[PDB]
């Protein structure tokens, strides 16, 4: 069934999915520094408390880059869900920058570094709560882009 | 056999997808290398200069290098094995160099931080191995892209 036109659909849905999964991986990098590198460079181990002011700045850079790549996402079909992650990335980046009072210093404590970018422990006052539904908003976007690719492939085998 | 071409397409789809995960992880290390080395959050612009304190930014980048080595280990493809094992070794060598130079890498000097995890620097003694697995993934990323294209190429043939 219209094999030459389907290949364009499959390729188009591929590019959209790839661009979302790239934003996905940037989020997973923000997660890895949160649960593996917060307050911890050594011969063994690959403990040092209360000094993460740099690690916070690097993760702020990733969050900006996440917004830039989201602005480059243009697909008239996924427009509903793209703008959701669009403004979700905005409230996140703004939140860390909104209060530099505990994030724009060299010695940010563990309970504050775990607070802004670690979505695991209990306290999520200023920070990781906004990281929370930014991840979830990309989950929605990633699933939709996956299903659009599957539906394009599904068009091949139709009777 | 349109069903068999379907599996060839979606299979090389997943490999390219998993390879681009390693690719995007590297762009994060690249982004924290060119936009957050020696830095902290500001109000108006978002980031302002903060010299000589990057002992956690390097610790952050180390976990991604560990995460990169993890994803490269999970890659299983008999057609891409050559380029897969080339990136695994370059991933092992990189994380090994960061742990080998722990004397000068709290608060690593921006001269050392730019030297250790930044591609665009002259010296690159503590970075040189960040280019040889970036380009190794580049070669890996191009091969997976062409494998997907070749699968779609089979769809339209006489």
């Amino acid at each position, epitope marked *: 069934p*219209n094999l*030459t*036109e389907i*290949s*364009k659909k499959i*390729t188009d849905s*591929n*590019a959209v999915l790839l661009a979302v999964k790239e934003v996905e991986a940037l989020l997973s990098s923000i997660d890895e520094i949160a649960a593996k590198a917060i307050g911890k460079i050594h011969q063994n181990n690959g403990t040092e408390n209360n000094h993460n002011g740099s690690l916070l700045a690097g993760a702020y850079a990733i969050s900006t880059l996440i917004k830039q790549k989201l602005d480059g996402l243009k697909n008239e079909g996924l427009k509903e869900k793209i703008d959701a992650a669009k403004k979700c990335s905005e409230t996140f980046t703004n939140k860390l920058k909104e209060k530099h009072t505990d994030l724009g210093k060299e010695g940010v404590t563990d309970a504050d570094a775990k607070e802004a970018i670690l979505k695991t422990n209990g306290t999520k006052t200023k920070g990781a709560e906004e990281l929370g539904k930014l991840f979830e908003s990309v989950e929605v976007l990633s699933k939709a882009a996956k299903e659009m690719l599957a539906n394009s492939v599904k068009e091949l085998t139709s009777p | 056999n349109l069903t068999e071409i379907s599996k060839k397409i979606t299979d090389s789809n997943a490999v390219l997808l998993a390879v681009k995960e390693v690719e995007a992880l590297l762009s994060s290390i690249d982004e924290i290398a060119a936009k957050a080395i020696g830095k902290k959050i500001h109000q108006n612009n978002g980031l302002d200069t903060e010299n000589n304190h990057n002992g956690s930014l390097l610790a952050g980048a180390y976990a991604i290098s560990t995460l990169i080595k993890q994803k490269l280990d999970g890659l299983k493809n008999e*057609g891409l094995k050559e380029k897969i094992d080339a990136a695994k070794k370059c991933s092992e060598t990189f994380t090994n160099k960061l742990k080998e130079k722990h004397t000068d890498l709290e608060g690593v000097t921006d001269a050392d931080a730019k030297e250790a995890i930044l591609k665009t620097n002259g010296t690159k003694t503590k970075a040189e191995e960040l280019g040889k697995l970036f380009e190794s993934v580049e*070669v890996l990323s*191009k*091969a997976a*892209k*062409e494998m*997907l*294209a*070749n699968s*779609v*190429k089979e769809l*339209t*043939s*006489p």
Partner: antibody
Amino acid sequence: QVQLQESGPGLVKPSGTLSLTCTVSGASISVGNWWSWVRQPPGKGLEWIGEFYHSGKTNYNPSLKSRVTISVDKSKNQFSLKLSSVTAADTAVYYCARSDLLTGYFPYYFDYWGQGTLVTVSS
Amino acid sequence: DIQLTQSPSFLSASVGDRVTITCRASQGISSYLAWYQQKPGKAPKLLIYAASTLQSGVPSRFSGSGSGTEFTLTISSLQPEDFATYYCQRLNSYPYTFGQGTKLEIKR
């Protein structure tokens, strides 16, 4: 820079076999990309001849399939072309070209060419 | 299988003029089309791929459009260096048949 260069005799007697070799530098045919032979008679348009990928897959122009053969020497980073039972209709400038995905994911576009060599079919 | 018809065969316009070249396919080829610029004695130079995308290095005054069977190459602000023969090419399947070509002369 990526550079392609054809070589071989420019005069072939009729009913003979055309043979050309493409030397590639700045790139590796074993690593990736499709590599092709393209044909242009004096004054006329262009005709694609054949292509190959390092995986082994090789496609030929159906109008030439019976008399065309492409060989690859990965150790020398060269590939060749063989046209048999040649006539005056085979006199042309012959190009070896590379195909690439560019910024897309399908299909491959001819983005690098050799300088081209002219072969004349005459007694 | 699929033939490409290029129009016109010959074109002559002045510097600064706008010119249009049409490529018609016998059946749909989606956006898998390319435009080439061949200067005398030289190999073809890719200008546009996937039928609207500008190849890097090519000036913006070259633009392509179309999908399916209708295809159009437009050169704005015509320049003396633009004298060449222009070819369209389909790339959905082998042989990737080229158009017959359009000869462009720069008026003076």
